[PDB]
Design a protein around this ligand. Structure first.
Ligand SMILES: [Cl-]
Ligand SMILES: [Cl-]
Ligand SMILES: [Cl-]
Ligand SMILES: [Cl-]
Lengths: 91, 91
């Protein structure tokens, strides 16, 4: 909510979902991101393409499965956002 | 624009305006923030109140002049956003 004050909530949760899922050791599937966030599949896809345009993620097809990975740039950004979230939540 | 992808552009520019103005040594006046950002005075005031609620700024009246200052919390957040902006702009 203080988060909504500064961030686009939907795009943020997509980015951080990719971050935590990859950090945990999972290949990140677009379907998985959808199950975790409050957006329809088509909206997730749209945001992923925007991230790709911004050189923050790369995606590739493995058969019928879309896999998303953070670029070094996307990773740094997610890490910094993680700290902002921490700071915002700690009074 | 990649900024708009993740951030609320209007709130962001208000926060960073406070950050750079204070860093330069100015008392930050609400009127000044308005001259720098693309928002009407009343919208700036609304955002400032939200920041105040989030304990990121404090404001006070000096006569008829509203002065805004970042709290330690607001300062840390602005600093982290500064790095994100830098990262986003450097390919
Ligand atoms: Cl992997
Ligand atoms: Cl990379
Ligand atoms: Cl001062
Ligand atoms: Cl303080």
């Amino acid at each position: 909510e203080r988060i909504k004050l500064l961030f686009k909530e939907k795009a943020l949760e997509i980015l951080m979902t990719i971050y935590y899922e990859s950090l945990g050791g999972n290949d990140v599937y677009i379907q998985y991101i959808a199950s975790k966030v409050n957006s329809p599949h088509s909206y997730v896809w749209l945001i992923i393409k925007k991230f790709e345009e911004a050189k923050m993620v790369e995606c590739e097809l493995e058969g019928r499965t879309k896999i998303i990975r953070l670029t070094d740039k996307g990773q740094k950004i997610a890490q910094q956002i993680k700290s902002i979230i921490d700071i915002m939540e700690n009074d």
